[PDB]
Amino acid sequence: MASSCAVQVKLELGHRAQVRKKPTVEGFTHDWMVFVRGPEHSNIQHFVEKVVFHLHESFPRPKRVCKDPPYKVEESGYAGFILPIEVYFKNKEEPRKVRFDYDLFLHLEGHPPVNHLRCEKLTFNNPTEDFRRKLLKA
């Protein structure tokens, strides 16, 4: 009751996108990759249960699930979109997960490729002992 605790964890969301030399048979012009990771020398898997990447409905199996690192999707397409990302926690109490609406933008042909990084800080106020242990390992 004397002591209080705030634990902060750093997530990095990002994507790369490059125009293909030749478009696919379906007419997909771009190759892209989206990811969620920790900083260098981090182990976010200690507290991350899974990452869910909600692709545009035009993709087959659009709710892409990554239970183990790396948390990323590699795809080909013709356009960018808002891509909701859910990071689930190895946590018994709330919050169970966090959601980000990720802007998976693609540049036009004749323009340089995309290499974007978006930093996200999470704060857990007075987590459970077990979750605190998990968070601080990352």
Partner: peptide, 10 residues
């Protein structure tokens, strides 16, 4: 509908 787009914009 018509969510998929090219360029950053904004």
């Amino acid at each position: 509908k018509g969510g998929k787009g090219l360029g950053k914009g904004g």
